[PDB]
Amino acid sequence: EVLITGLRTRAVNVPLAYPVHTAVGTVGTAPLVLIDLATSAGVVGHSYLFAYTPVALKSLKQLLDDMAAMIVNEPLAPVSLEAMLAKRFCLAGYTGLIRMAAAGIDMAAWDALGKVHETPLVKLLGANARPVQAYDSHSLDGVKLATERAVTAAELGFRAVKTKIGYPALDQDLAVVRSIRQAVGDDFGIMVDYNQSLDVPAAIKRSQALQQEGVTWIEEPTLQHDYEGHQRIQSKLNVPVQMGENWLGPEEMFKALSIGACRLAMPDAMKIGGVTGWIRASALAQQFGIPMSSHLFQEISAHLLAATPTAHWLERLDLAGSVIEPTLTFEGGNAVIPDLPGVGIIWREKEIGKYLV
Amino acid sequence: EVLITGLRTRAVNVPLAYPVHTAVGTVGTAPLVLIDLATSAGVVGHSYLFAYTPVALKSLKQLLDDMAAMIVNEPLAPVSLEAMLAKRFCLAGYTGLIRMAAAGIDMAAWDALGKVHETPLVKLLGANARPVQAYDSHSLDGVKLATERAVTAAELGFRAVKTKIGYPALDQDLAVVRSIRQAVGDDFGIMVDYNQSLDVPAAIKRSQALQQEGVTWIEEPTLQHDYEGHQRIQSKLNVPVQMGENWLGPEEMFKALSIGACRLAMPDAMKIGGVTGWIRASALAQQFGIPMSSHLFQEISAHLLAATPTAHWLERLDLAGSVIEPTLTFEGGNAVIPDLPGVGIIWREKEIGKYLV
Amino acid sequence: EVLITGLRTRAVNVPLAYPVHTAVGTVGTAPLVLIDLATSAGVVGHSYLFAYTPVALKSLKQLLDDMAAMIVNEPLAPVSLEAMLAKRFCLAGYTGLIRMAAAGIDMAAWDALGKVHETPLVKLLGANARPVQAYDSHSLDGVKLATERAVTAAELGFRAVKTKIGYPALDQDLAVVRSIRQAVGDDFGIMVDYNQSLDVPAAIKRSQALQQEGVTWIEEPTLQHDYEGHQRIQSKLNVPVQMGENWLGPEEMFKALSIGACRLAMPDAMKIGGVTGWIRASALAQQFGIPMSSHLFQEISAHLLAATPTAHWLERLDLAGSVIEPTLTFEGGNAVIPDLPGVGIIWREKEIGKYLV
Amino acid sequence: EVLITGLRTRAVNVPLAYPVHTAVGTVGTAPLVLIDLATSAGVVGHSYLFAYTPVALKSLKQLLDDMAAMIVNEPLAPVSLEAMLAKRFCLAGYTGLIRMAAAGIDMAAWDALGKVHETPLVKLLGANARPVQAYDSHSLDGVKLATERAVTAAELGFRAVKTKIGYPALDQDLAVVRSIRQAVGDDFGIMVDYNQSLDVPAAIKRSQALQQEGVTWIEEPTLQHDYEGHQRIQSKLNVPVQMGENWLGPEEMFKALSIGACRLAMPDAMKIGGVTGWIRASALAQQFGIPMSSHLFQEISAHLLAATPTAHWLERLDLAGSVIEPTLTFEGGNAVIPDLPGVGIIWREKEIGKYLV
Amino acid sequence: EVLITGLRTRAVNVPLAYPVHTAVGTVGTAPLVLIDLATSAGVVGHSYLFAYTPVALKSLKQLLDDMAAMIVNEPLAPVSLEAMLAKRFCLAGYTGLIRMAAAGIDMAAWDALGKVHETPLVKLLGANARPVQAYDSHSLDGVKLATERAVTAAELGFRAVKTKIGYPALDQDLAVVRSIRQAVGDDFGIMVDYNQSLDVPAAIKRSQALQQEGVTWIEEPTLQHDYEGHQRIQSKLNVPVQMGENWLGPEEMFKALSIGACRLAMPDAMKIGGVTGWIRASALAQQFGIPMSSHLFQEISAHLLAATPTAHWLERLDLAGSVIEPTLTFEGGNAVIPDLPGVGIIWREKEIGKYLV
Ligand SMILES: O=C([O-])C(O)C(=O)[O-]
Ligand SMILES: O=C([O-])C(O)C(=O)[O-]
Ligand SMILES: O=C([O-])C(O)C(=O)[O-]
Ligand SMILES: O=C([O-])C(O)C(=O)[O-]
Ligand SMILES: O=C([O-])C(O)C(=O)[O-]
Ligand SMILES: [Mg+2]
Ligand SMILES: [Mg+2]
Ligand SMILES: [Mg+2]
Ligand SMILES: [Mg+2]
Ligand SMILES: [Mg+2]
């Protein structure tokens, strides 16, 4: 009985705090698609998608625009909407850009549903808000900048940071981790992210060296789809292998956990299938005994982690801060959900116009 | 913010329409614990528990009354409440009667949350109401009564019935199924339930003979906890093995599905862990590719199945109709969710007094 | 040395000979993206993509146009180009629409390389042209039309047809297959396609009944990504399960074959990763002992199957005949590769204008 | 339409730089069979076989001579030729000397096909030439000569060397590795090769000792056909076990990788089945996540590795330098493919006459 | 002490009684290498090899002649000689033609050792002579000839025959088996041989149809090296899959039995590694519970089967009768070992001259 009455998309290329350098390439600004889902109840649901590369940005906006035909005049019932989209895209492939688009709709539909009920999303999911520990996510920064960023994060109350590694030599990876460690002390988390950049033997060699140094987890050591390879790496380590940012739907998470690819998981709220997909992922992580963190999407992930039985860490990487009001706050390194209906995303309407593509 | 302010229980032994004879003993009236969860918002959540045998009825009410103090003044946040109860009962064993008591609290809490938002439970879960196909659940009735009840059900619009089997002779099981089939035709479901009454070899022999007759599924052929034995029985059959009414929590479901015990599942809304546990179960059934039906608890199961990705059948077995208003209806053999906030359970307050233990 | 100098795409919605009705919806005209790859040698490579639904058509063209800048000035070396694209799209997700776009580039690049060498693609791959047996692919046509089309195909020299099944009743599936079989005899192939429309238990029941009738294979009985479910269905059948049209890349094929999902494979030249991906797939099918057929893309698949060690059947389903010259012919039910350089695709330039979106 | 018009073989015993001592025996000169495949296009394909021991040299030449009857007047289509030979030798056993002969034909046929198209082989395979890192392959040289050969290699720009080990005592293996390491520094690869000389327990003991020293890989620790044994050794190591030089066809590689025998592979261009076999192997190594190096045959392996998705190292061991012009060069320790049609093998016709058998 | 003093080989192409037509080509006369092993005790060991195709005949003789120098002056100790040859050929590959050559040496060495001790080979192995049941091995003969030969064999006292199948149509396979069965009755063995001619799905379909007819075993349904495929075929059958004639060494047998490829085995005395290899094989067949028959080599196989714990059938297919005296006899369908020292092979010296290549 509340119906969707409109879908609007805006493509933007927005400025970050610091360019996200990785072992496989740099992201400087962020290409986002901002989504507004109008309803018969007046309220408007807000979400956004991350396109990764500007090469996919227009394509992703166009796909969503064409997908409006499937959702306008449908009831605002995200679980029912998701089943419908899965069926309509059965042939095309309910994965990749299509799935990402479907997840943007889901996230905006749950924001609207929270607004219909004048309640924060975390409460609509049946949970209480609580503070959620966050790590500050950095990049392939070199020794000097990595160490500076770590010090600043520790000063702000974060109890962990993540750096991106996969320099040409193992010794360069180790020099960065060692430098951070000396600056932040032993009682501090140092997560490291390979961004898929190693083959299995190289990953075993580098990871056993990092384990000796002392790191909190080793993220995506090899090609993301190679769950068997991740299992073989994890088999040679005490430190946990972390992955999951690239899982497209809970069905891909299921395949990975079924063969023991990793001891930690970190679904992406977009790629996993939005709120609907996230809650399903949550249930899998619980049964498989996997502590579950987030990947990007810090605004909605604060809510979702509060409803996740094995919640572990929130990834602080603020891609959309230039266009979303800072209603999510951090106190003592913990994310603090705002007391606002739905997700608590309010657009900075005058800023968005600066960045439209 | 909205808080639980009180808990009241009433233990009743209520009359059914027809004693539930099984191969392992018969349930002639139903022992129930009726639950009222008061809240700071003025609304009262309603749920009930089934104690199976009167021997466990007073014990279950006593347990719930002694749990009032742990939930009074807690937020009405069913997911957060479930986590607290799991932790409190870590030592005692969060299973059996304790888990059943937790599930009754969960179901009444979700009823109350629907009421707080003035919305049916199905919509609060993010799904649309839809009619759900139901089968009429009968008992170890003999050829004459079994065939009469089947015809009556078909007359009323049901497209399937379940009968309880496990007579002293296989020939008797087959005689009942044949006489039903003659009276209802080939385009009709006949589910059969062994209620754990056979050892593995006996189950293989009886089930392959039933399979030749044409039945829709074979339910609980052996001891419910023996997942490996259910796997061995399934390995010898084309017809699906059905089980799950006795899983205490989604963790037991996960263990059974992980070894291939069955090709169908039917969780019990109480034993699975209420709404919270059911939603977890539904995620598991989706990933493992298992069509998921309900067991008893028809009032809440109509809502839950509408939010279940692999929803299969609703079991119609009306245990509580003597004390709950008939707001759930059946049309054309489909359950129709009432348009009422929460679950739509309203007590028949003048009838309850008759049945107090 | 030979370089790509440009990329042009045209999005069309083209008329078929007969709408493709499936159990999960119907494809009434075909949305295609036509690709022209210009090179420094003067020759132009041609390929096309199938977008399945018009909803994805503009998005796919947009994506390819935004990929021009990454391939312009690169060498015309399809293997090296594929590696570059895999790396560039590591973060976004090298799957779904992105992977499909990469595959269209690959197919046009191999067409261009054949042209550079003035040699049919089959010979450039190191194989001899040979006729390849083809089946004529029909749709959810009903008893009358299905039987007519089967007779017509048999009259024309085809030795097999495929029909789409998954009618509301199993009896209807069986009625269609029986009426075909009566019209064509026992010495004729009848493949059947469920287009992912059944859950595992339903697929076991329907498939064992079809198996009694005599069918050649059962294609995509359940959700395409559910390899474990396809294994469970295959485990109950003598007839081969066929799948693979929905594998995105050889890595998905490898996962499916590694767990015994099917006893036949049919990769899609676009989803498998073009020629580059097809040749990989062919190596896998050889080792796993899986006879390998094609899915759509008949123009290029005739070349590719001639270089496939376990080549089985070519699927005749002419999606692009309204815009491509009929240089591929069929004689005695066998596809005959034209003696033209590259793939032998030549555009009907005056027809394309009619169908532009 | 280009046909094979002749096959010529020449058996030679040619001089090496240094005798190849192994733990299982010494190779001084090299017994080779030189193969010329004449064609209707005028061009002549060149390849060679390595016979390992002079005991097999005449046999291998005679077999090829008798195999001429199967290939003369056939089309120059290596993939089609390979399928034909596999069928004709189905009964005899398409392995061993037979398979080696078939691979010599394949390698010469692809050289001819490159020549027909006036293009280097790497380009005909769809890839770009790039430099490929090479290690210099030495022998069971003792401490003094091993150290001298390593120093000379490092001076020439090689970044790794391989020594052959399996001296009577483990301490002798370790003394050689230690001496090299001191001479070349920590940032240098030291590969070691056992040449099948240890049983599994001895291999676990010696390899864990070598791992402590620091080596790059441990090659063929036990009997080559014992894939289970290799798996058991690899299970006790962090350092990768390398094998594959003895795989006769991709089918043997498949069997080894299916059970986890090794974390690195190094097919032999002859034994694996030539170019055709190599490309199939390439596809397997990619899926199984195995970095893939070459074994001998440096001339063609430079081409092949440039088309191998998981390319790792080229083995520099110049068996045929006395009879093939040095068109393959090494710059900075990288092999540099010559810009010549086909493989770039040109016979030293006046030298061949010195070495004929 | 007793030493080998010389080796002589003669390559012959000998006439059979009836060309051996198979689904994969036909063997019209037999190419054999006849072996004479001279010793310091005055006695000469005799054996022969089968080269399958004349293409390999000269190569095999050449190889053996070039192996004379490695065995001359070695002790006549077949086990110690086999170990030496395995080590010498470690690099070349102790398989295929090389392994076959080693096996001919082994068989002639055991013949010589029987002669040294003046005792039949069976007694030297520690067993008693006994008659061994034999089947008469026929070819792809057609309904008329197949049925004639079956009757002739039954008339002579054989209790089973083998026919070669794999005609273009399954109906033809079935027509041949039915016409045999009609002519010989139900109390008679009909073995069928596919000679590797079918892919796995084709083999499942053909074999289940043959199984309905009643056959004794199904031999080599698919590619001989594909043990996993033979397992998949066996998994669908009640009738036993038979294989093993193509195992090169007991190590290949071990790999096949380890994965459940077959429920019967039939090693070839030459390919399995002669007497030495056969005795190893017999130990494996015993442990794995596999009834073990012979393949060709009837003269020596009668001795070997008498020492085989799970001895099943001797294959009567007399390849060498044109050049070996008929000292092996058949009575009542059983092979009778002659009372002669060693194997009982005596050359027809005046006939050999007729058949020299
Ligand atoms: O931050 C991450 O974990 C990831 O590497 C990303 O940047 O998308
Ligand atoms: O619980 C029951 O009464 C029975 O086992 C059922 O399935 O309905
Ligand atoms: O894609 C299709 O239209 C169908 O599934 C087929 O197999 O042809
Ligand atoms: O060099 C090698 O890797 C191998 O041992 C050989 O010499 O053939
Ligand atoms: O080798 C053969 O001729 C045949 O395969 C047999 O079993 O006899
Ligand atoms: Mg990451
Ligand atoms: Mg029951
Ligand atoms: Mg299909
Ligand atoms: Mg080596
Ligand atoms: Mg045979």
- Over chain B, what HEC string results? CCEEEEEEEEEEEECCCCCEEEECEEECCEEEEEEEEEECCCCEEEEEEECCCHHHHHHHHHHHHHCHHHHCCCECCHHHHHHHHHHHCCCCCCCHHHHHHHHHHHHHHHHHHHHHCCCEHHHHCCCCCCCEEEEEECCCCHHHHHHHHHHHHHHCCCCEEEEECCCCCHHHHHHHHHHHHHHHCCCCEEEEECCCCCCHHHHHHHHHHHHHHCCCEEECCCCCCCHHHHHHHHHCCCCCEEECCCCCCHHHHHHHHHCCCCCEECCECCCCCHHHHHHHHHHHHHHCCCCECCECCHHHHHHHHHCCCCECCEEECCCCCCCECCCCEEECCEEECCCCCECCCCECHHHHCCCEC
The number of angstroms, rounded, from the C-alpha of D53 to the middle of its chain's C-alpha atoms is: 16
Look at residues D280, D300, D277, D276 and name the one whose alpha carbon lies nearest to residue D288: D280
* Active-site annotation of B, residues: 164, 295
Whether C46 is catalytic: no
Check contact A-B (3+ Cβ pairs < 8 Å): yes
Query: Cα–Cα distances in Å, from D140 out to D145, D196, D220, E330?
Result: 9, 14, 15, 57
Q: Where are the alpha helices (DSSP H) in A159-249?
A: 170-184, 200-213, 227-235
Query: Cα–Cα distances in Å, from C289 out to C218, D237, E79?
Result: 18, 32, 37
Nearest to A98 among C22, C70, C97 (CB): C97
d(CA C44, CA C46): 7
Chain E residues bordering chain D (beta-carbon distance below 8 Å): 22, 24-25, 27, 51-60, 62-63, 66-67, 70, 87-93, 95-99, 195-196, 223-226, 246, 248, 251, 255, 271
The number of angstroms, rounded, from the C-alpha of B161 to the middle of its chain's C-alpha atoms is: 16
Look at residues C318, C336, C299 and name the one whose alpha carbon lies nearest to residue C114: C299
Residue C176, amino acid: V
d(CA D69, CA C254): 38
Minimal C-alpha gap between A171 and chain D (Å):
10
Cβ distance C104 to C282 under 8 Å?
Answer: no
- Which residue's alpha carbon is at the smallest distance from atom 3 of ligand 1? A295
Look at residues D315, D314, D307 and name the one whose alpha carbon lies nearest to residue D281: D307
Q: Using CB atoms, list chains with 3+ pairs below 8 Å to chain A.
A: B, C, D
Nearest to A77 among B83, B123, B251 (CB): B123
Cβ distance D350 to D327 under 8 Å?
Answer: no
Secondary structure (3-state) at E41: coil
Tokens of B250: 């989604």
* PDB experimental method: X-ray
Handedness of CA D150, D154, D157, D158 (dihedral sign): positive
User: Which residue precedes each gap in chain D (C to N above 2.5 Å)?
Assistant: none
The number of angstroms, rounded, from the C-alpha of A12 to the middle of its chain's C-alpha atoms is: 19
User: Which residue precedes each gap in chain B (C to N above 2.5 Å)?
Assistant: none
Tokens of E279: 């005795």
Interface-testing mutation among B123, B254, B257, with chain A (most A C-beta atoms within 10 A): B123
**Tokens 């119609």 label which residue?**
B316
Which residues from D are below 8 Å from C250, CB to CB? 283, 286-287
Query: Cα–Cα distances in Å, from A315 out to A28, A49, A246?
Result: 18, 16, 15
Q: In degrees rounded to 5, what are phi and psi of residue B319?
A: -75, -35
Distance from the CA of A124 to the center of ligand 9, in angstroms? 64
d(CA A230, CA C3): 37
Closest approach atom of ligand 4 to CA D317: 1
The number of angstroms, rounded, from the C-alpha of C218 to the middle of its chain's C-alpha atoms is: 17
d(CA D112, CA D40): 11
Q: Where are the alpha helices (DSSP H) in chain C?
A: 57-66, 68-71, 78-88, 96-116, 121-124, 142-155, 170-184, 200-213, 227-235, 250-258, 274-287, 298-306, 349-352
Provide the phi-psi class of A25: left if phi over 0, else alpha when psi is between -120 and 50, else beta.
left
Q: Using CB atoms, list chains with 3+ pairs below 8 Å to chain D.
A: A, C, E
- Which residue's alpha carbon is at the smallest distance from atom 7 of ligand 5? E295
Tokens of B158: 């049901």
Which residues from D are below 8 Å from C341, CB to CB? none
Instruction: Give the residue on D whose Cα is nearest the Cα of E62.
Output: D59
Resolution for the entry shown, Å: 1.8
Q: Which domains does chain E have, with CATH numbers?
A: 1-118+349-357 (3.30.390.10), 119-348 (3.20.20.120)
d(CA B38, CA B18): 34
Q: Could you please report the per-residue DSSP string of E120-187?
A: BHHHHTT-----EEEEEE--S-HHHHHHHHHHHHHHTT-SEEEEE---SSHHHHHHHHHHHHHHH-SS
User: Cβ–Cβ contacts within 10 Å for residue E356, how many?
Assistant: 10
Q: How many CB pairs under 8 A join C and E?
A: 23
Secondary structure (3-state) at E329: strand
Quote the DSSP letter at residue A292: B
Distance from the CA of D307 to the center of ligand 6, in angstroms? 30
Instruction: Give the residue on C whose Cα is nearest the Cα of B240.
Output: C201
Give the list of residues 6+ apart from residue E34 with CB closer than 8 angstroms, or none. Answer: E9, E10, E11, E12, E46, E48, E323, E347, E352
Residue E107, amino acid: M
Which residues from C are below 8 Å from D287, CB to CB? 250-251, 254, 280, 284
Residue E20 Cβ < 6 Å to ligand 5: yes
Tokens of B292: 């998921």
